[PDB]
Amino acid sequence: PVDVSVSIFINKIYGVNTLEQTYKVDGYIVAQWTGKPRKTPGDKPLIVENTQIERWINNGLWVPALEFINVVGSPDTGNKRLMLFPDGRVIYNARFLGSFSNDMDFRLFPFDRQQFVLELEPFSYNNQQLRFSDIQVYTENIDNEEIDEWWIRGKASTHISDIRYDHLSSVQPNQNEFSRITVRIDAVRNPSYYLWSFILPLGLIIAASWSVFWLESFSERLQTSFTLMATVVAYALYTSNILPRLPYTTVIDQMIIAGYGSIFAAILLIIFAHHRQANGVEDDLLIQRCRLAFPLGFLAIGCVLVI
Amino acid sequence: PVDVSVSIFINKIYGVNTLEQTYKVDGYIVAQWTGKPRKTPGDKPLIVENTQIERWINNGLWVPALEFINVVGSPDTGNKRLMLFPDGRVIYNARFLGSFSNDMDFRLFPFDRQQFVLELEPFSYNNQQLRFSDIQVYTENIDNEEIDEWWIRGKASTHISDIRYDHLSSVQPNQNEFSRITVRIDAVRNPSYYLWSFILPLGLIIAASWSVFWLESFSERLQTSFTLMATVVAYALYTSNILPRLPYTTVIDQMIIAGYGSIFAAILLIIFAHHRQANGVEDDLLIQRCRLAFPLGFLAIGCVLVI
Amino acid sequence: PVDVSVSIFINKIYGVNTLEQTYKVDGYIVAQWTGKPRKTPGDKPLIVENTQIERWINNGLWVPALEFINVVGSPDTGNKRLMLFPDGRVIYNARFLGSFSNDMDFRLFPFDRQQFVLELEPFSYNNQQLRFSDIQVYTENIDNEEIDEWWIRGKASTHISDIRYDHLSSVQPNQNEFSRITVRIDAVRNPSYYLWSFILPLGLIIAASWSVFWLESFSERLQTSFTLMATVVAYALYTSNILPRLPYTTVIDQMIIAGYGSIFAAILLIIFAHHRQANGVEDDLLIQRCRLAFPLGFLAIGCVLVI
Amino acid sequence: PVDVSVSIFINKIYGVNTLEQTYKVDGYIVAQWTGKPRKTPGDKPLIVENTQIERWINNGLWVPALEFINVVGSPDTGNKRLMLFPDGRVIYNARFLGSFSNDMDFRLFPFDRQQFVLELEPFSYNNQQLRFSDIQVYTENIDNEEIDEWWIRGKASTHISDIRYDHLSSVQPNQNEFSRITVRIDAVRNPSYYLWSFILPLGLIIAASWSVFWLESFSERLQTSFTLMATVVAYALYTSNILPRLPYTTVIDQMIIAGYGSIFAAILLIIFAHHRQANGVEDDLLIQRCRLAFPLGFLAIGCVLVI
Amino acid sequence: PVDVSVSIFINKIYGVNTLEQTYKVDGYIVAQWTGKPRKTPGDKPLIVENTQIERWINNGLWVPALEFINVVGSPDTGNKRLMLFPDGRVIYNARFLGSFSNDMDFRLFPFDRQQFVLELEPFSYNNQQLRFSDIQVYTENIDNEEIDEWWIRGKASTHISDIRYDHLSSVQPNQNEFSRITVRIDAVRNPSYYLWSFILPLGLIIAASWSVFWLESFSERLQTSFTLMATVVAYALYTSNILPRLPYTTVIDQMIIAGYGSIFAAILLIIFAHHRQANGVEDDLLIQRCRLAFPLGFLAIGCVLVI
């Protein structure tokens, strides 16, 4: 009941797709299992590269198809290398790059919790078993990571489990237990660009949106919160043309609705202060002077945003 | 007249193309049919992986080309595996990912009715027949589905039918009846993002578009509905730069024409109220004060929109 | 001098590329020619699928390379199937999807005249000849075609011609006449989306662009046609971010220049009406009141647009 | 010392990449060289299509790898066809489409001088020689070329030269002279779209930008050249969302900097005319009235732009 | 212990990906190592092209898989050519184009320091050794490099090192030292387009943003810095739709936050100058007249930006 080593070198994890929950991973995969002894030219082991491997299968070598369960479609395999020993054992070495799937919650946006995953499990093979799992993360921790999109918690996180397929094949004297390596890697998004060049200027206009109350005439207080409407809208443009499309409202995606509210707030006060009186045109004495009373009723309800 | 099992594991259905009526599906396909008995090494069945399969065809194995009828072009096949038995029967196992076609009505937009489809039918083979059809939906129902683009009605919906090709081949002693499995899967769009960060702020400026009537002077009522025109237009920008291009006006695509109207409404009242009088410059006493009479003539005709 | 049948099933024609004059077509291609008789296992004809075809070429089967003349690069062939008979004749069946070229005049834009084309002609073969040409259009006419980008005139339009290549090979005892099937299919663009959500709102602001004349003061008539300049420009934005790039001015692409004109009209009247007088500041009595005299001098010159 | 014919049919040259200096070319390539005589089935020459060619190489046919020097990566080869004669000579015929490199100066933008290139030279072969070079341009001259992106000067322009590689292989008894065909084709950009729907409206607002001087009050002259700043900026938007990114300022790319200047001109005159006086608030009598003195100081310095 | 020559012709380095830290490189790769002598047809060396190479491996030729360590996935190999000598030695020649990885600091943006890299090291082979490394840069220095995205410091920069893999294979009598060529090439970004059509117009509106202080009334000083807010925001639009997305704030990306500040400066002075007095409405005598006191408090703190 065959024992199989696995070793997986991660080289880079790059470019997350955000709609599709996808991330590209590049590296090396290595499997060792001890086969019945063999004469090797010389008597030091024999090295078989790329083209040649398929030939030794035709001659009758067993090599197990190991599959990435959570890959998307098929991957890109670089250099196949079967290195096989005189004492039998055989070591499969493969460079690869391929797209991978996993759940990704992008709601809490520019402060992002995230985790990357590979799952590897033999394709056609029941009781051949994944022995022990290795994972060598070349990528470096508290490094120059302020040059990378992501920071990595985090060191490689293994787990070799057993998998039961209910609806299965046509031979079940107790035989639906496949051996699956699952490899996890934790990460957080580099909240830089999104704060400085993105959260803040939202604030600055969300801010200056309130100085509509320090306007004099009523006719001025109105027509200014209209080219404040346009300022919000044309800022949600600069959102779309930079930010990654999603199907949930994000953090930022809310701060932008906060905009549209604190201005449709304005319009329902300024257009209140002018017709709540006791004569013709007498703007309400205090209502006009919430000048700095609903910014601390925003930073208030905006600390209800933090709820 | 050959019996064939089919089993189809759906893994994910992802990324709908909206122009093209297209959706990518990833999973496993499995076919079993019982062939004339055979000696297998050992006497437990024999497993043939990937490369090797083509070899056994050249040796004289029958394996039927089964075709996805509604695929777009060709798909991406991962791990071919012929598992064949001593008592004859043969089980074909294949990973796959491929683009698929089907009609999709996107009119009623951000509240979307939708259904996904595969059709599978033998390519060259008349009376060989698809026995019984299985379909195992790994994807999960009322799950964390508010992380996914789509919710799934819905469980797998089968149907094995017979297909008649009129204009056909050059042998017709009654022989144009091909066996087609049709698999259906129902879905609805996750109306989240489109409501909160998209339908609502349309409403809020559609809304505040009416406070042009609570303006005083005639000269102010005009020039304000002009930087209200610009507000609508620059909001249909944020539409294009987020929403999926189509060839029909959608729901949202209408609420945006509603905008252009309730402002070209304004311009044909404000420019009416000033020159319908009995002197020089006397703004019509009641016409000016439909202030909240055509918003409930909008929400009125906008409940004719719901007709 | 070999006779060849052709039959071409169109499944879908989808996604036109507008720069490149390109359109993807998916379907089945079938060729039948009668070859010297042959024993078939059993004595009912023999069916050869995919992999196997190349083998029978190596054994010495003739199968003619037929080429799509106007394809772009190479296409995507799905299921090859050689079905060959006891009485000799052979039937080649292939699924395919591929990009195709043809001239396409996109000038008269959202009211588009268009035609799709395949040309098929034997690649290496002079006097082997295309017998009779068939074309089965699965796609349906006055259907639910308001769900599709295109309406189809129109039924399949054939034509088997002969082609002379001047500068040719190194054997010319009268031998440069290749047999080419040409298949045409007519279409018109679904002028929906472009009318309602696109031509009309252009009109509504082209419209309200004229109510700058029903402004009072001179200082108002100016500064309003400036945030009317911006309204046009920011509307041609919503053009670019939706419409397909081209190298000619279209219909819509003109109505947008019409905009820039009827406002640089305004600026060259309003800035005329103020300095054509007989004193200091006396706005010209009638010139100011072309209020509705150059809209019917626009719809006039705009019915010279229809010239 | 082997003689080789070449003939190159161009079918289309399409889609220039502007950053990358790249253009796709589709067509046929043909090479003829006379080899030692051979018996052909029948005695009319023998035609070898696609698959089969590789076989005759394995049997011992010489076929020289000819390489496109300036291709990008590899190209897409359609139909290989070896047609070989009884008297020896062999004719290679190949369909192809492939990306090509060449220097391209895009500075003088929408009036573009340009030239397309292929370079073809044997890959492993020193003294085998390209005999005479042919080039058949199917594409047509002063045709309906106002439907195409480009006009073609111009007829095919050949040149068969010799190439010396300095640092070279490990056999140099005078042997580093490779035979390279260079084919050139001249072109000009279709300056339509870019004039009418693009250079002109830039002019019309660059124009109306000057009517800020025909404003009355000082307070009006300022605040209007501010929603003129915004008009320029939001027009350089419509530039980015249509025009092809480059790393040099183009023609148009300057006319847009001309905009920003003739408005920061305005601001440094209007804000000069108000504080250059001999009292409190007396706007300079003549300075205010350069009303049409720096448009002919623009069209002046703008005919220094033409320098 | 096998000696191997290497020679690497760079043809072009093009299209940097900015998120992914990636750049495409096209050229030729050549390896020579002297093998045990051999009879060559004729007795001049023997040339083996493309298809044929794999055959000679099957007959028993050693050819070492050399791997680009920092490639992304796999590359695009054009023309394989084994040229092997009578005296033994063998010369491998290959055209290639492939994507490459390396750290890239894009912070100091439009004035960019950068370096391109290939690393080449034998894949399966320990003590076979890379002899001496060559690198021929066809691309030209202080050339017409103002037509190219990049300038090249700089001539090819070699280095042949030894690499130790800690966690390694299952044979360690001192054997984990692989021979790696590292090739470097220096570059700087062509700061043209980004200065003239991009840094300057930012300045010009950053500039004219200050002429809000040479406004008269308080009510004017406010409502003008609001359509100055919109001017900044709609200019950061023209940034997104041209500039390459990154995860750090760049140089330009800061000058844009500088904008938002020097306007939220304005709003926090103009709204200060009006309510810091000693009565009803008396605008502060000097505060109003920092007219040209915080531009030299900007160019001041903006020479703290240069810190």
D124 contacts D42 by C-beta, under 8 angstroms = no
Which class for C280: exposed (0-12), middle (13-18), buried (19 or more C-beta within 10 A)?
Answer: exposed
SS (H, E, C) chain D: CCEEEEEEEEEEEEEEECCCCEEEEEEEEEEEECCCCCCCCCCCCEEEECHHHHHHHHCCCCCCCEEECCECCCCEECCCEEEECCCCCEEEEEEEEEEEECCCCCCCCCCCEEEEEEEEEECCCCCCEEEEEEEEECCCCCCCHHHCCEEECCCCECCEEEEECCCCCCCCCCCCEEEEEEEEEEEEECCHHHHHHHHHHHHHHHHHCCCCCCCCCHHHHHHHHHHHHHHHHHHHHHHHCCCCCCCCCCCHHHHHHHHHHHHHHHHHHHCCCCCCCCCCCCCCCCHHHCCCCCCCCCCCCCCCCCC
CA distances (Å), origin C142, targets C119, C150, C151, C187: 26, 11, 8, 12
| Cβ–Cβ below 8 Å for B237 and A237 | yes
| Cβ–Cβ below 8 Å for C256 and D79 | no
β-strand pairing of C113-122 with B177-189: unpaired
C-alpha B51/C-alpha B77 separation (Å) is 13
Fold of the CATH domain D192-289: Methane Monooxygenase Hydroxylase; Chain G, domain 1 (1.20.58)
Cα D165 → chain centroid: 28
C-alpha B206/C-alpha B252 separation (Å) is 12
For residue D268, what are its two tokens?
A: 């440094």
D234 contacts E239 by C-beta, under 8 angstroms = no
| B172 backbone dihedrals φ, ψ, rounded to 5° | -120, 40
Q: What's the gap in Å between the CA of C32 and the closest CA on chain B?
A: 10
| Cβ–Cβ below 8 Å for D7 and C167 | yes
Q: What's the gap in Å between the CA of A115 and the closest CA on chain B?
A: 15
Comma-separated ranges of CATH 2.70.170.10 domains in chain D: 3-189
Within chain E, where are the H helices? 51-58, 192-194, 200-208, 218-240, 252-273
Chain E positions touching A224 (Cβ under 8 A) are: 222-223, 226
Q: Is B245 on the interface with C (CB under 8 A)?
A: yes
Q: Is B74 on the interface with C (CB under 8 A)?
A: yes
C-alpha E256/C-alpha E252 separation (Å) is 6
Q: Is E78 on the interface with D (CB under 8 A)?
A: yes
Comma-separated ranges of CATH 1.20.58.390 domains in chain E: 192-289
| Cβ–Cβ below 8 Å for A197 and E267 | no
**Residue A133 in 3-state DSSP?**
strand
C-alpha E275/C-alpha E278 separation (Å) is 9
B205 contacts A267 by C-beta, under 8 angstroms = no
C-alpha E307/C-alpha E301 separation (Å) is 9
**Residue B230 in 3-state DSSP?**
helix
C-alpha C257/C-alpha C253 separation (Å) is 7
Q: Is E192 on the interface with D (CB under 8 A)?
A: yes
Q: Which residue has the tokens 């791997």?
A: E67
Q: What's the gap in Å between the CA of A44 and the closest CA on chain B?
A: 29
For residue A204, what are its two tokens?
A: 């600055």
Interface D:E, Cβ pairs < 8 A:
139
Resolution, Å (one decimal): 4.2
CB count in 10 Å sphere of residue A3: 12
D212 contacts D228 by C-beta, under 8 angstroms = yes
* Out of A125, A171, A256, closest to residue B45 by CB: A171
C-alpha E48/C-alpha D66 separation (Å) is 14
The closest of A63, A127, D58, A91 to B51, measured between CA atoms, is A63
Give me the DSSP letters along B65-107: -EEETTBSS--EE---EEEE-TTS-EEEEEEEEEEEE-----S
Chain D positions touching E15 (Cβ under 8 A) are: 19-20
| Cβ–Cβ below 8 Å for D123 and E81 | yes
Dihedral over alpha carbons C65, C69, C75, C80 (to 10 degrees):
-30
C-alpha C103/C-alpha C116 separation (Å) is 9
Chain B positions touching C52 (Cβ under 8 A) are: 57-58
The residue among A5, A85, A238, A291 with the most chain E CBs within 10 A of its CB, best to mutate, is A238
Give me the DSSP letters along A155-193: --B--EEEEE-SS--S--SS--EEEEEEEEEEEEE--HH
Cα E49 → chain centroid: 35
**Residue A34 in 3-state DSSP?**
coil
The closest of D305, A151, B247 to C196, measured between CA atoms, is B247
| B198 backbone dihedrals φ, ψ, rounded to 5° | -150, -45
Interface C:D, Cβ pairs < 8 A:
133
Residues 6 or more apart whose CB falls under 8 angstroms from that of A37 comprise A86, A87, A88
Q: For B199, which DSSP code? A: I
Q: For A199, which DSSP code? A: I
For residue D206, what are its two tokens?
A: 């660059």
Which helix (H) or strand (E) segment holds residue B49: the answer is strand B46-49
Identity of the residue numbered A12? K
C-alpha C11/C-alpha C138 separation (Å) is 6
Which class for B155: exposed (0-12), middle (13-18), buried (19 or more C-beta within 10 A)?
Answer: exposed
C-alpha B29/C-alpha B45 separation (Å) is 20
Give me the DSSP letters along B3-14: EEEEEEEEEEEE
Chain E positions touching D262 (Cβ under 8 A) are: none
What residues are paired with A88 via a beta bridge?
Answer: none
C-alpha E122/C-alpha E181 separation (Å) is 10
C-alpha C236/C-alpha C219 separation (Å) is 27
CB count in 10 Å sphere of residue C202: 20
CB count in 10 Å sphere of residue D72: 23
Half-sphere exposure for B275 (CA within 13 Å, toward CB): 9
Q: Is D74 on the interface with C (CB under 8 A)?
A: no
| Cβ–Cβ below 8 Å for E79 and D73 | no
CA distances (Å), origin E25, targets A79, B202, B216, E10, E72: 20, 48, 67, 7, 12
CB count in 10 Å sphere of residue B111: 12
C-alpha D164/C-alpha A44 separation (Å) is 46
For residue E91, what are its two tokens?
A: 């010369």
Chain B positions touching A305 (Cβ under 8 A) are: none
End-to-end CA distance of chain E: 55
* Out of A148, A224, A235, closest to residue E223 by CB: A224
Neighbours of chain A (3+ CB pairs under 8 A): B, E
Superfamily the domain B192-301 falls into: Neurotransmitter-gated ion-channel transmembrane domain (1.20.58.390)
Q: What's the gap in Å between the CA of E244 and the closest CA on chain A?
A: 10
Cis before D154 (ω within 30): yes
Chain D positions touching C80 (Cβ under 8 A) are: none
The closest of A178, A196, A176 to A120, measured between CA atoms, is A178
| Cβ–Cβ below 8 Å for E47 and D257 | no
Q: Is C102 on the interface with B (CB under 8 A)?
A: no
Chain D, residues 3-42, CB within 8 A of chain C, namely 7, 12, 14-15, 26, 32
Half-sphere exposure for D108 (CA within 13 Å, toward CB): 11
β-strand pairing of B150-152 with B177-189: antiparallel
Cα D255 → chain centroid: 22
Q: Tell whether domain E3-188 is in CATH 2.70.170.10.
A: yes
What residues are paired with C23 via a beta bridge?
Answer: C16, C100
**Residue B290 in 3-state DSSP?**
coil
Structure solved via: X-ray
| A260 backbone dihedrals φ, ψ, rounded to 5° | -55, -25
The closest of B235, B188, B192, B191 to A249, measured between CA atoms, is B192
A258 contacts A305 by C-beta, under 8 angstroms = yes
The closest of D70, D52, D69 to D61, measured between CA atoms, is D52
| Cβ–Cβ below 8 Å for C264 and D216 | no
**Residue A36 in 3-state DSSP?**
coil
Within chain A, where are the H helices? 51-58, 192-194, 200-208, 218-240, 252-273
Chain C positions touching B57 (Cβ under 8 A) are: 51-52
Q: What's the gap in Å between the CA of A98 and the closest CA on chain E?
A: 8
B45 contacts B38 by C-beta, under 8 angstroms = no
The closest of C251, C165, C256 to C203, measured between CA atoms, is C256
The closest of D200, D145, D89, D216 to C219, measured between CA atoms, is D216
The closest of E193, E110, E144 to D247, measured between CA atoms, is E193
Give CA angle at B17 (B16, B21), nearest 5°. 100
Chain D positions touching C237 (Cβ under 8 A) are: 234, 237-238, 241
Residues 6 or more apart whose CB falls under 8 angstroms from that of A122 comprise A4, A64, A65, A66, A67, A128, A130, A178, A179
Give the number of residues written for chain C.
307
For residue C81, what are its two tokens?
A: 């199937």
Dihedral over alpha carbons A46, A51, A55, A57 (to 10 degrees):
80
E100 contacts E70 by C-beta, under 8 angstroms = yes
Interface B:C, Cβ pairs < 8 A:
135
**Residue B213 in 3-state DSSP?**
coil
The closest of E104, E99, E147, E100 to E250, measured between CA atoms, is E104
Q: Is B52 on the interface with A (CB under 8 A)?
A: yes
The closest of B26, B32, B2 to B93, measured between CA atoms, is B32
C-alpha D205/C-alpha D211 separation (Å) is 10
SS (H, E, C) chain C: CCEEEEEEEEEEEEEEECCCCEEEEEEEEEEEECCCCCCCCCCCCEEEECHHHHHHHHCCCCCCCEEECCECCCCEECCCEEEECCCCCEEEEEEEEEEEECCCCCCCCCCCEEEEEEEEEECCCCCCEEEEEEEEECCCCCCCCCCCCEEECCCCECCEEEEECCCCCCCCCCCCEEEEEEEEEEEEECCHHHHHHHHHHHHHHHHHCCCCCCCCCHHHHHHHHHHHHHHHHHHHHHHHCCCCCCCCCCCHHHHHHHHHHHHHHHHHHHHHHCCCCCCCCCCCCCHHHCCCCCCCCCCCCCCCCCC
Q: For A244, which DSSP code? A: P
Cα E98 → chain centroid: 15
b/e per residue D267-279 (b: at least 16 CB within 10 A)? bebbbebbeeeee
Which helix (H) or strand (E) segment holds residue B135: the answer is strand B129-137
**Residue E112 in 3-state DSSP?**
coil
CA-based nearest residue in chain C for residue D223? C223
Chain A positions touching E219 (Cβ under 8 A) are: 215-217, 220
Q: Is C235 on the interface with B (CB under 8 A)?
A: yes
Cα A265 → chain centroid: 36
Chain B, residues 270-289, CB within 8 A of chain C, namely 271, 274-275
Superfamily the domain D3-189 falls into: Neurotransmitter-gated ion-channel ligand-binding domain (2.70.170.10)
Q: Which residue has the tokens 């700058």?
A: C212
C-alpha D28/C-alpha D176 separation (Å) is 29
C-alpha D249/C-alpha D240 separation (Å) is 13
Give me the DSSP letters along B231-276: HHHHHHHHHHTTSPP-SS--SHHHHHHHHHHHHHHHHHHHHHHTTS
Identity of the residue numbered B42? G
Give me the DSSP letters along E9-74: EEEEEEEEETTTTEEEEEEEEEEEE--S----SSSS-EEEETHHHHHHHHTT-----EEETTBSS-
| Cβ–Cβ below 8 Å for B136 and A257 | no
